[PDB]
Structures are given as structure tokens and as C-alpha cells.
CSV table of C-alpha atoms and ligand atoms in Angstrom, one decimal:
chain,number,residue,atom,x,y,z
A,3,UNK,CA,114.0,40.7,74.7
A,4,UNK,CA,111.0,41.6,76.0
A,5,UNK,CA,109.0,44.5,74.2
A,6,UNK,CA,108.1,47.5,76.7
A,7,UNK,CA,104.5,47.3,75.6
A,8,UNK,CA,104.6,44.0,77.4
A,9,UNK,CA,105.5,45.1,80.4
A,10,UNK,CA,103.4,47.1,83.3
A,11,UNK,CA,105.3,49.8,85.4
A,12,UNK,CA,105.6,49.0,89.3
A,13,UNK,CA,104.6,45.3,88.8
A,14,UNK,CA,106.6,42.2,88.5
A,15,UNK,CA,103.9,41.6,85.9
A,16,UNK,CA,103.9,40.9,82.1
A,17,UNK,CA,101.2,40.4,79.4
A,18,UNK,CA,101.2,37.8,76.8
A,19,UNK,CA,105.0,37.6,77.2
A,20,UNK,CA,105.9,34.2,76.8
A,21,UNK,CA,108.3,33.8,74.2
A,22,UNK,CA,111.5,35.3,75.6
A,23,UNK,CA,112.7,32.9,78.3
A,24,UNK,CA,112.7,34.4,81.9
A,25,UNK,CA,112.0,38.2,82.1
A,26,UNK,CA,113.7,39.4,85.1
A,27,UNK,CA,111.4,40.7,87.4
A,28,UNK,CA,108.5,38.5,85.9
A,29,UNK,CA,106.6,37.6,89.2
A,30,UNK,CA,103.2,36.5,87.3
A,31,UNK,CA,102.7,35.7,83.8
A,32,UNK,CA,99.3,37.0,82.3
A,33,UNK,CA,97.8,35.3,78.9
A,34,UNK,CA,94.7,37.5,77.6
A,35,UNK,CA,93.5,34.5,75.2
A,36,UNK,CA,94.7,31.1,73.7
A,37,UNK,CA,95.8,32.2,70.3
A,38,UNK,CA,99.1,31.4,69.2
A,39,UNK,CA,100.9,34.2,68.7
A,40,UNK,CA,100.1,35.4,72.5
A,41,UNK,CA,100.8,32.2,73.9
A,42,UNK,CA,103.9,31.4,71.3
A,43,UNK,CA,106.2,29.8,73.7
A,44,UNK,CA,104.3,28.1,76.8
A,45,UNK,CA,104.7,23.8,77.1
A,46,UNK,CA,103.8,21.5,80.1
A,47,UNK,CA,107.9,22.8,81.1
A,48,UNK,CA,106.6,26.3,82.3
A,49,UNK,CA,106.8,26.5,86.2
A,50,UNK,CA,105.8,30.1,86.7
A,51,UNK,CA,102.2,31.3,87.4
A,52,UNK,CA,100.1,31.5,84.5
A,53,UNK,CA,96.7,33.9,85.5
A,54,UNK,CA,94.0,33.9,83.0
A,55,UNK,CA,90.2,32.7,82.1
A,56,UNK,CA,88.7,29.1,83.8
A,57,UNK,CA,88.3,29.1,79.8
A,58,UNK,CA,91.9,29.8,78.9
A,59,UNK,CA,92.8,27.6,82.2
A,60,UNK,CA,90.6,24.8,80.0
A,61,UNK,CA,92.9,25.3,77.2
A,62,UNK,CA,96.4,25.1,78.9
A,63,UNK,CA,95.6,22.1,80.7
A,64,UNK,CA,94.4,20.0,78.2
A,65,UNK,CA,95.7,21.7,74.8
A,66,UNK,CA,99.4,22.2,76.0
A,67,UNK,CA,99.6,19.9,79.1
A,68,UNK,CA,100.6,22.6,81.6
A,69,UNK,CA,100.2,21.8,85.1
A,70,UNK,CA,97.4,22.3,86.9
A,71,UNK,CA,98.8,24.1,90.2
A,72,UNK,CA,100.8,27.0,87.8
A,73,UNK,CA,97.5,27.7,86.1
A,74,UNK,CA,95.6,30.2,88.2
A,75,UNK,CA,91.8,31.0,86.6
A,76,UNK,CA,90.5,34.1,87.6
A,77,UNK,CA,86.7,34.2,87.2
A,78,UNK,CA,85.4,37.6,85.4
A,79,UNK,CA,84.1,40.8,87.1
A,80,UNK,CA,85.5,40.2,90.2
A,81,UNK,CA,87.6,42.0,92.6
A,82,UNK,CA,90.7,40.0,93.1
A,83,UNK,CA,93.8,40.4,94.9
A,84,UNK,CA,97.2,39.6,93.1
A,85,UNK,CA,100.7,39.5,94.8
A,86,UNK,CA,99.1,42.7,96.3
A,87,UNK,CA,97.5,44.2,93.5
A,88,UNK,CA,94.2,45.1,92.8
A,89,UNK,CA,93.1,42.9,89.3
A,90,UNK,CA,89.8,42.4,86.9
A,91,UNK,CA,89.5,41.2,84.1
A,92,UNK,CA,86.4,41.7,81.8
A,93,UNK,CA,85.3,39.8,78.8
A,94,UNK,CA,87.3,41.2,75.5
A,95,UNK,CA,84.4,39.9,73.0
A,96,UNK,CA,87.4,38.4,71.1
A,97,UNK,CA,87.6,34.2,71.3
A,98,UNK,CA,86.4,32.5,73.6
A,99,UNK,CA,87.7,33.2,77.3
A,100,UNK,CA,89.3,35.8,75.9
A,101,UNK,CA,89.6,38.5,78.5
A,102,UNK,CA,91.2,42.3,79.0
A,103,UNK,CA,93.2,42.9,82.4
A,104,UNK,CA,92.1,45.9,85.0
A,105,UNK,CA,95.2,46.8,86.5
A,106,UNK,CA,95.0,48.7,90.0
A,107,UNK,CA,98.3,50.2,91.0
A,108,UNK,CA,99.3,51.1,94.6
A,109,UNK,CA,100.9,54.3,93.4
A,110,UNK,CA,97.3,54.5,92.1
A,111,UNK,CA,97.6,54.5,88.4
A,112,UNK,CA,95.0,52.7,86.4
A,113,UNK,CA,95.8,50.6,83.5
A,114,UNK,CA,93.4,48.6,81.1
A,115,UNK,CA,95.3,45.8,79.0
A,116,UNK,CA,92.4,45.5,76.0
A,117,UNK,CA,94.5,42.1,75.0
A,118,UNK,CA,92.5,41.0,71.6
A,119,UNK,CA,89.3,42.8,71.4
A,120,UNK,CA,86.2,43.8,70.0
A,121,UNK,CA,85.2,47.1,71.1
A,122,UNK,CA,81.5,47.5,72.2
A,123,UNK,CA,79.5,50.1,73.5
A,124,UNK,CA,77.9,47.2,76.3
A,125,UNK,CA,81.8,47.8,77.9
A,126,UNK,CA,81.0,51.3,78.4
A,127,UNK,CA,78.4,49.7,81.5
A,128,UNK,CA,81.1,47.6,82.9
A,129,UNK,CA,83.5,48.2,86.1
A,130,UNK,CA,85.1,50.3,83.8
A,131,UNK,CA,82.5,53.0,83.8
A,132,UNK,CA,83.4,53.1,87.6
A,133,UNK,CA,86.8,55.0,87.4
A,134,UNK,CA,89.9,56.9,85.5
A,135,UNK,CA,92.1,55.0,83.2
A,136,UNK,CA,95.3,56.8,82.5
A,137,UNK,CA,97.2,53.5,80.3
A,138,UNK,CA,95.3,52.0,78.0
A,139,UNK,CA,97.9,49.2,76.0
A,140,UNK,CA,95.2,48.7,73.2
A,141,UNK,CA,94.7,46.2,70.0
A,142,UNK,CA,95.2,48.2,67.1
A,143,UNK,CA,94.6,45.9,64.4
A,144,UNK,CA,92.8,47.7,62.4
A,145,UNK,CA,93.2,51.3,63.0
A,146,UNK,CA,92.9,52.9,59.7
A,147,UNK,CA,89.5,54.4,58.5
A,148,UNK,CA,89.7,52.3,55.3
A,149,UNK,CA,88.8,48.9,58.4
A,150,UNK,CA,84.8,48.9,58.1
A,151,UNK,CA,83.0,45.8,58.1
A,152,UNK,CA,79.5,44.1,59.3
A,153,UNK,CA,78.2,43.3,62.6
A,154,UNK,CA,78.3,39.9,63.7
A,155,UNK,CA,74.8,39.4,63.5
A,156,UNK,CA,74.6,40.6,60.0
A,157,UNK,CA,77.4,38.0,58.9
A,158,UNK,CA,75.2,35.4,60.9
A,159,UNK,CA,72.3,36.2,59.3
A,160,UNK,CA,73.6,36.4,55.9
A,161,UNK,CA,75.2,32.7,56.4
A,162,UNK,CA,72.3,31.3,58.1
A,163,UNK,CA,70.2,32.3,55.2
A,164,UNK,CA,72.8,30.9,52.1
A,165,UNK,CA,72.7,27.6,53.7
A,166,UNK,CA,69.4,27.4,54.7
A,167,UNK,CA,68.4,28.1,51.4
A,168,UNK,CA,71.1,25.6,49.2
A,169,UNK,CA,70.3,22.0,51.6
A,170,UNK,CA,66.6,23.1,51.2
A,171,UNK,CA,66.9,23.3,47.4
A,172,UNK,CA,69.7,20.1,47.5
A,173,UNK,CA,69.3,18.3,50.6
A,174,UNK,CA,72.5,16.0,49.2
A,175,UNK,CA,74.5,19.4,49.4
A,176,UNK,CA,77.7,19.7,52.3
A,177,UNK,CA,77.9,22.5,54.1
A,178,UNK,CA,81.7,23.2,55.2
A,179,UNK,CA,82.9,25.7,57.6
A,180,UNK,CA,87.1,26.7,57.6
A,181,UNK,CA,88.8,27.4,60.6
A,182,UNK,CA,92.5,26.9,62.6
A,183,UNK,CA,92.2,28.8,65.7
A,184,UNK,CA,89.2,29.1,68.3
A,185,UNK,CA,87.3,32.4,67.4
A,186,UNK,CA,83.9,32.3,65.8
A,187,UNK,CA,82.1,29.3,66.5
A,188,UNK,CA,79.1,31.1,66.4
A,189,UNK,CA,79.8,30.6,62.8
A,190,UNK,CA,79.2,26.9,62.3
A,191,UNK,CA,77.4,26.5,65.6
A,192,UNK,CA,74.5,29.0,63.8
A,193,UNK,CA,74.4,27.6,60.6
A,194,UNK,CA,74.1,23.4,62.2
A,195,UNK,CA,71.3,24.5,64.1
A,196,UNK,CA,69.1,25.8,61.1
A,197,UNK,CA,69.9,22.6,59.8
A,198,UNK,CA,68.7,20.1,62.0
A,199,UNK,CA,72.3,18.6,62.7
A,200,UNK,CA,75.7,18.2,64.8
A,201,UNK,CA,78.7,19.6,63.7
A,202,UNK,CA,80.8,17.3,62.8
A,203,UNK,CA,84.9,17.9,63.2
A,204,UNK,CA,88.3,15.8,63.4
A,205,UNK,CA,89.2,14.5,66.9
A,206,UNK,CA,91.9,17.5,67.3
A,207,UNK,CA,89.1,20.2,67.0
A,208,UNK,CA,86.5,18.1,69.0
A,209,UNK,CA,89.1,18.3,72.1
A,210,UNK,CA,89.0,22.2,71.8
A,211,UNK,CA,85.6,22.7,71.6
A,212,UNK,CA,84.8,20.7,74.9
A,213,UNK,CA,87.4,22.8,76.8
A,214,UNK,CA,85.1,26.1,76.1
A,215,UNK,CA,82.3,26.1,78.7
A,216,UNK,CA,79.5,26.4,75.8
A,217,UNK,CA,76.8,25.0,77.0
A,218,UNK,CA,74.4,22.1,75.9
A,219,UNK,CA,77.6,21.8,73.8
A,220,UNK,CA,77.8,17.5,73.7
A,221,UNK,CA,74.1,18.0,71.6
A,222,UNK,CA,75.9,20.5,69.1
A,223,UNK,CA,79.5,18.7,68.0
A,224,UNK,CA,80.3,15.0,66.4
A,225,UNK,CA,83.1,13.3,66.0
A,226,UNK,CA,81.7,11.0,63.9
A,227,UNK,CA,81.5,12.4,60.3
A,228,UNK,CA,79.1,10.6,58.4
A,229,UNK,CA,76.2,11.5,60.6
A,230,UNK,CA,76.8,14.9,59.7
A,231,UNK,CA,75.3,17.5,57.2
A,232,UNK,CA,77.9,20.9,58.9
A,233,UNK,CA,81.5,19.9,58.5
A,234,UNK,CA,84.9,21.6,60.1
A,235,UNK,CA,88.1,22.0,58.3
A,236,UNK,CA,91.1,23.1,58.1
A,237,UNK,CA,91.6,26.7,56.6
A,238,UNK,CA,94.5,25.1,54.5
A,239,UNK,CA,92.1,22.8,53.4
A,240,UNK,CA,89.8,25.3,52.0
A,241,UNK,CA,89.9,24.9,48.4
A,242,UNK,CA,89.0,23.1,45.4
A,243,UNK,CA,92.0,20.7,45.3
A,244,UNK,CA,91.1,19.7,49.0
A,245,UNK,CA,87.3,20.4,48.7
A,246,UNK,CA,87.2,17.7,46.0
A,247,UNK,CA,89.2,15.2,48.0
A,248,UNK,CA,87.5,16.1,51.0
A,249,UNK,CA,84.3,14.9,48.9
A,250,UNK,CA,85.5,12.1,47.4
A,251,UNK,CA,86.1,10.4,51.4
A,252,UNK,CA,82.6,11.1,52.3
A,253,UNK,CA,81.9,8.3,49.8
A,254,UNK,CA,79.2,9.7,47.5
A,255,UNK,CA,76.6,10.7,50.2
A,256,UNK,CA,76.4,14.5,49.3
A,257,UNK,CA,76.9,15.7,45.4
A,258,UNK,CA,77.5,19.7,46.1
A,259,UNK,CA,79.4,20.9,48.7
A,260,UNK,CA,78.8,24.8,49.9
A,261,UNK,CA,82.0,25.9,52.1
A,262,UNK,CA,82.4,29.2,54.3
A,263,UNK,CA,85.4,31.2,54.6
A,264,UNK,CA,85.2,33.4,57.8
A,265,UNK,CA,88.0,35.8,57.5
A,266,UNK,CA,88.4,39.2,59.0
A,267,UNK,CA,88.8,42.2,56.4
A,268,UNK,CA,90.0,41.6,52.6
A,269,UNK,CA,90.1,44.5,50.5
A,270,UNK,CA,86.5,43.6,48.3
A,271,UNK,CA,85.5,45.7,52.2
A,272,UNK,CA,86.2,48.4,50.1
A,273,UNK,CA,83.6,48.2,47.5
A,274,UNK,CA,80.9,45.3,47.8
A,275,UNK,CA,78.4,45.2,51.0
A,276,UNK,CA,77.6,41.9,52.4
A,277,UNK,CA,74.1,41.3,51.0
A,278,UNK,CA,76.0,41.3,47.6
A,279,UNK,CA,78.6,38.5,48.1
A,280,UNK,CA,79.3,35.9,45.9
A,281,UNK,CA,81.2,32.6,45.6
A,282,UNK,CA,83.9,31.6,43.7
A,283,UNK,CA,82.2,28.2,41.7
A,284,UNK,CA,84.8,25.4,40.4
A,285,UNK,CA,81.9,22.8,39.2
A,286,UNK,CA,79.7,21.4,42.6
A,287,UNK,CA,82.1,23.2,45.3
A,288,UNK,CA,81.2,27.0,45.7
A,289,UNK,CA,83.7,28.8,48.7
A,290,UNK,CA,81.9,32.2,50.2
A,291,UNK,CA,84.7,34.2,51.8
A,292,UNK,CA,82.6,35.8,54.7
A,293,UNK,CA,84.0,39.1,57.0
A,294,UNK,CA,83.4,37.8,60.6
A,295,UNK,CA,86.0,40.2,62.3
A,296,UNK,CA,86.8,39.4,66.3
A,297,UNK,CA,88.6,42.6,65.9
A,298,UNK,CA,87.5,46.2,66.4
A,299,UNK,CA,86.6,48.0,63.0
A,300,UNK,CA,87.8,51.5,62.9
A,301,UNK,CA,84.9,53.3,64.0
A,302,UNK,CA,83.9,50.8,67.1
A,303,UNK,CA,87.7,51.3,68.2
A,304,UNK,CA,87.6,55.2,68.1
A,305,UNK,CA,84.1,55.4,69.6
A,306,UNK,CA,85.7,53.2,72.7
A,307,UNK,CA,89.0,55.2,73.0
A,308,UNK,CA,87.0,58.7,72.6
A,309,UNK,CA,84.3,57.8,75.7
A,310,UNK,CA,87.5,55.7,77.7
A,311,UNK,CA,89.5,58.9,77.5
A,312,UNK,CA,92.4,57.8,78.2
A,313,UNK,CA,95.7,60.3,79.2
A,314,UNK,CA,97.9,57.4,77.3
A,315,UNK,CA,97.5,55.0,74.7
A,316,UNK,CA,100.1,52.6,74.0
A,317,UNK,CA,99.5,50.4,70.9
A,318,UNK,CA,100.0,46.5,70.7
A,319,UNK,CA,100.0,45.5,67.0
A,320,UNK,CA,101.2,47.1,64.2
A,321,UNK,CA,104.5,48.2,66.2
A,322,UNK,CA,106.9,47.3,63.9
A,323,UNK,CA,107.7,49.9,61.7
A,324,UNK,CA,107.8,53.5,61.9
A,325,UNK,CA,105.8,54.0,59.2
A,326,UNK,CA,102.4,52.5,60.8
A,327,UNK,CA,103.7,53.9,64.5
A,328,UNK,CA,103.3,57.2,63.1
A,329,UNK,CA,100.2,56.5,61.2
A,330,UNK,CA,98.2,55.5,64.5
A,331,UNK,CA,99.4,58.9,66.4
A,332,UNK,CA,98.1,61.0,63.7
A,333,UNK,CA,94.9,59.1,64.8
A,334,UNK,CA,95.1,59.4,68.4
A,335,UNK,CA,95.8,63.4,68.0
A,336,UNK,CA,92.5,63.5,66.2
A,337,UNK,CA,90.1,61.4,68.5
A,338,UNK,CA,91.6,63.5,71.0
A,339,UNK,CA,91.5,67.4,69.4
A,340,UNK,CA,87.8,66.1,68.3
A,341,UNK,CA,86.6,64.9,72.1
A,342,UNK,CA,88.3,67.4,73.9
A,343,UNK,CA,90.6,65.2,76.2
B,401,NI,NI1,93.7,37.0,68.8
């Protein structure tokens, strides 16, 4: 059954809400990113409108096989009318085509859907600067002052640099990237082009990447293995067990491979910064767990909620028990008593 933090008052509309059957009233169907947990139910047997990103669009077309007429993309920034209501949606800086959802009500209640996000203060100059928000149905995944990590930029630079560095030293070295979702491509797609190359991926991953509207993007990706020095894996794959197999197959043309692990926070957040990190080092193979968070760290969440003042907040992950419900009010009061909302 339907959770009511899925659901938006005096609409027939619902939000990543599509792995219950029919919900009564359901009149649209809105998907803020293709990840699997928002999408978990979806198949080319869905016959209901689908709205979301071209990019999304992209993905549900030629991922899942849904049909094209029950997909409707919504470009961003734009004004657009929906069964009669007023709708934007804005770039989340989560995946790609990842978006959140303006909602304009006609009793005239205004509603922001944050869906997946990485709060930013370059959101604070979009159409949301324009007017009130009183709802704000927002991604609490790490809403707990112990969640700090680096910028983006820091974590590219950081990787950019190790790798750089290990194929100049060894230029018969590997670099491997883990992944199993879309989400930070910037990743691999920084590192290949210090290093002269393609990335180079299965045919499954190639299929993804060419529905995402990057562009120059048939220069930056392979299929074809051999003729490259950045390879994709599975995050399963990841290891020393499957990082030596992996280096058996590519038939002795590199003798050191140097793998990535982007993962969002781990607890060594707490006490090691990330011009200290280290690999763990099983002979030639040496795995660098790296903190490339899609997700708002504490501080970029508050600073978001406390200039978006919002009259209600309504959170979308961590719902489950009482325990952290509680937990994130505590924080709300605060941000609220502090900023004088
Ligand atoms: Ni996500």
C-alpha cells in the first residue's frame, strides 16, 4: 500500500510509486531518476503515463522496453501544464536526468519533490528563488551531523592525480573503475581522459551510457576491451578474487591493475581526510575506496532547508523506524529555532 509520503494532496499524482499495483486515484505516474529502488516495479506492461527527464525517457525505452506513447519527457525549467496543473522540474544534481518536481496547486499550495538530490547553493538562483514553498518531501539520506564528506571536485581531483601518476610510473598498469547503477560517470570519464583513452565497459553498460545525452560521448566509451587502458566493472566484481581473474582474461597485456571504489560515506569519514587515503594492496591489485557522494552531506542539506524555509518538511528515506523519524525532527526543530522560520 502506498506510503503517504508518495502521494501529493489534491492531485491524482504520485512520486516514484511504482511498486504497489494500481493506486486509486493515480492519474500520472512521476519517476524522479532511473535508479532501482524508485523505479522497482515498472516493465514494457505499464500502460499509465510515465512523466519524467528526455534522460529518464532514454532509459525506460531502451533499458526496460516501455512504450514510447506512455513515456512523457518533460524538458527542465520550463513551465508546463499537467492534467491542469502547473509543473517544473529542475535538475536534482543526483544521476544523470535525475530531476526534482515543482508542484503548483490550484488551491495554491506549493510543493517541491527534492526526489534524490545533492543540495547546492546554484539551486538557490533557480525558479525556486521565485516563490513560497510550504511542502518540501525531501532526501534525507544523510541527515545526521556525523554525514561530512568532500566536494566532487576534490574526489576528482584526488583520482585524476593517483592514476595519472601510477600508468606514468607503469604504463602496463589497469586502471579499473566499480560501479552497478548510473551515478558518477564523472568518475571514470575524468580519469580516461588524463589518460589518453576510451573507457572501455561490457555491452550491458555501453547501452546505458548511450541513453544519457553526454555529449561527444561515442569518442569517450568502448566496447571493445583490449583497446583500452580505463576499464568498467561490476561493483561485485571489485575485489581480489575477481580483480585477479579479471587480469588473467586480458591475456598478459597489463601486470598491475589500480581499481576505484566510488562509494558514498563509510565510517573512515570520521577520521581520515581525502588527501590521506590509502589502498588496500593484495600483491599487483591495489582497490582505493573513494567518497563520491550524489547525496547531500549534512551541512549542504541544512544550509538548503534553512534558506528554502519551508512551513513543512516531510522526509523520504530513513522512514522506517521510529527511532530515526524522531532523530530527523530533533533536526528540523533546530534549523528552524536557529533561522527563525
Ligand atoms: Ni538514487
Amino acid at each position: 500500500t502506498c506510503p503517504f509520503y508518495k502521494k501529493i494532496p489534491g492531485t491524482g499524482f504520485t512520486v516514484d510509486a511504482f511498486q504497489y499495483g494500481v493506486v486509486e486515484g493515480c492519474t500520472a505516474y512521476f519517476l524522479t531518476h532511473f535508479h532501482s529502488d524508485h523505479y522497482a516495479g515498472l516493465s514494457k506492461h505499464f500502460t499509465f503515463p510515465v512523466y519524467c527527464s528526455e534522460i529518464t525517457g532514454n532509459l525506460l525505452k531502451n533499458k526496460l522496453h516501455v512504450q514510447e506513447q506512455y513515456i512523457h519527457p518533460l524538458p527542465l525549467d520550463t513551465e508546463c501544464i499537467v492534467n491542469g496543473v502547473k509543473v517544473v522540474l529542475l535538475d536534482a544534481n543526483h544521476c544523470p536526468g535525475a530531476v526534482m518536481i515543482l508542484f503548483y496547486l490550484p488551491n495554491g499550495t506549493v510543493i517541491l519533490h527534492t526526489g534524490d538530490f545533492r543540495a547546492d547553493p546554484s539551486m538557490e538562483r533557480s525558479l525556486l528563488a521565485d516563490q513560497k514553498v510550504h511542502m518540501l518531501y525531501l532526501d534525507t539520506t544523510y541527515c545526521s551531523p556525523e554525514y561530512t564528506f568532500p566536494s566532487q571536485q576534490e574526489v576528482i581531483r584526488f583520482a585524476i592525480n593517483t592514476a595519472f601518476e601510477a600508468v606514468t610510473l607503469n604504463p602496463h598498469a589497469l586502471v579499473v573503475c566499480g560501479t552497478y547503477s548510473i551515478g558518477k560517470e564523472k568518475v571514470f570519464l575524468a580519469i580516461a581522459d588524463v589518460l589518453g583513452s576510451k573507457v572501455g565497459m561490457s555491452q550491458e553498460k555501453y547501452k546505458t551510457l548511450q541513453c544519457l545525452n553526454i555529449p561527444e560521448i561515442n569518442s569517450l566509451i568502448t566496447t571493445d576491451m583490449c583497446s583500452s587502458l580505463v576499464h568498467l566493472l561490476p561493483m561485485m566484481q571489485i575485489n581480489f578474487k575477481g580483480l585477479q581473474s579479471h587480469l588473467k582474461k586480458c591475456g598478459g597485456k597489463y601486470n598491475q591493475i589500480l581499481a576505484f571504489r566510488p562509494t558514498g560515506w563509510t565510517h573512515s569519514n570520521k577520521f581520515t581526510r581525502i588527501a590521506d587515503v590509502i589502498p588496500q594492496t593484495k600483491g599487483n591489485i591495489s582497490i582505493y575506496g573513494i567518497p563520491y557522494s550524489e547525496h547531500s552531506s549534512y551541512l549542504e542539506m541544512k544550509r538548503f532547508v534553512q534558506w528554502l524555509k519551508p512551513q513543512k518538511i516531510i522526509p523520504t528515506v530513513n522512514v522506517g523506524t521510529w527511532k530515526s523519524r524522531s532523530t530527523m525532527e530533533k533536526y528540523f526543530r533546530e534549523w528552524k529555532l536557529e533561522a527563525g522560520y
